[PDB]
Amino acid sequence: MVGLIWAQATSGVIGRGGDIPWRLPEDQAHFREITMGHTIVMGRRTWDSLPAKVRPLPGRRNVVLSRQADFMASGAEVVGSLEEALTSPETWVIGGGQVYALALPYATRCEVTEVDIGLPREAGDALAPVLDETWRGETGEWRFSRSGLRYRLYSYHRS
Ligand SMILES: NC(=O)C1=CN([C@@H]2O[C@H](COP(=O)(O)OP(=O)(O)OC[C@H]3O[C@@H](n4cnc5c(N)ncnc54)[C@H](OP(=O)(O)O)[C@@H]3O)[C@@H](O)[C@H]2O)C=CC1
Ligand SMILES: Nc1nc(=O)c2c([nH]1)NCC(CNc1ccc(C(=O)N[C@@H](CCC(=O)O)C(=O)O)cc1)=N2
Ligand SMILES: [Co+2]
Ligand SMILES: [Co+2]
């Protein structure tokens, strides 16, 4: 099982300036619940974006994809191809834009948080992958985050 998990603006933006232009504590808690105990696979830029406090993210096998053969990520495994990272029964791809796109053909689940923020797409933004016909979607209801933004969770799946 390979799943992707991400939060996006309605426009599809997931990242800007190497970070994320919002933070929803309820969404991060959901992220922790879904990924805890499992493999998480991330691009090197997303590793760099993790707060030092949660590098590596606890209770998870942290795997970092990089083309730098000697890149070191303390507490993580650094691999040079995505296939090396897919050995565990449940693997969660946690971004960013490049690695979501690379992982999508392997994926059967996407856990998507849509954030009700009006953020037009800009050059250099990281974007959510596009989910075609093969994906079946189940939406939840809109919720209010203590951060002030509304959000809702989509669970997409395919065989
Ligand atoms: N909203 C959300 O839910 C999330 C948002 N984000 C945001 O996304 C942005 C980062 O996404 P992005 O810029 O797309 O970068 P990624 O996080 O996708 O990492 C890109 C890097 O991964 C490595 N990589 C990519 N493809 C390959 C490959 N085929 N083989 C080997 N290594 C590879 C390279 O590392 P190297 O350069 O070391 O070779 C490349 O520079 C940040 O803004 C981050 O905050 C991230 C995760 C979730
Ligand atoms: N749905 C989703 N939202 C995100 O914000 C998100 C995502 N997916 N995938 C990757 C990603 C990259 N950034 C980050 C940043 C911080 C933490 C973090 O601190 N996580 C703690 C949260 C614990 C909690 O809040 O209860 C963890 O232990 O997972 C995780 C991912 N962020
Ligand atoms: Co689990
Ligand atoms: Co269903």
From Swiss-Prot:
Substrate binds at residues 5-7, 27, 32, 60, 100, 113. Gene3D superfamilies: Dihydrofolate Reductase, subunit A. One of its GO terms (cellular component) is cytosol. Pathway: Cofactor biosynthesis; tetrahydrofolate biosynthesis; 5,6,7,8-tetrahydrofolate from 7,8-dihydrofolate: step 1/1. Inhibited by isoniazid metabolites. The prodrug isoniazid is metabolized to isoniazid-NADP adducts that inhibit the enzyme at subnanomolar concentration. InterPro entries: DHFR (IPR012259), DHFR-like_dom_sf (IPR024072), DHFR_CS (IPR017925), DHFR_dom (IPR001796). GO terms for molecular function: dihydrofolate reductase activity; NADP binding; NADP+ binding. GO terms for biological process: dihydrofolate metabolic process; folic acid metabolic process; one-carbon metabolic process; tetrahydrofolate biosynthetic process. The keyword Oxidoreductase applies. Its EC number is 1.5.1.3. Residues 1-158 form the DHFR domain. Keywords: NADP, One-carbon metabolism, Oxidoreductase. It catalyses: (6S)-5,6,7,8-tetrahydrofolate + NADP(+) = 7,8-dihydrofolate + NADPH + H(+). NADP(+) binds at residues 6-7, 14-19, 43-46, 65-68, 80, 94-99. PANTHER family: DIHYDROFOLATE REDUCTASE (PTHR48069:SF3). Belongs to the dihydrofolate reductase family. Key enzyme in folate metabolism. Catalyzes an essential reaction for de novo glycine and purine synthesis, and for DNA precursor synthesis. This is Dihydrofolate reductase. It comes from Mycobacterium tuberculosis (strain ATCC 25618 / H37Rv). The lineage of its organism: Bacteria, Bacillati, Actinomycetota, Actinomycetes, Mycobacteriales. The gene is folA.
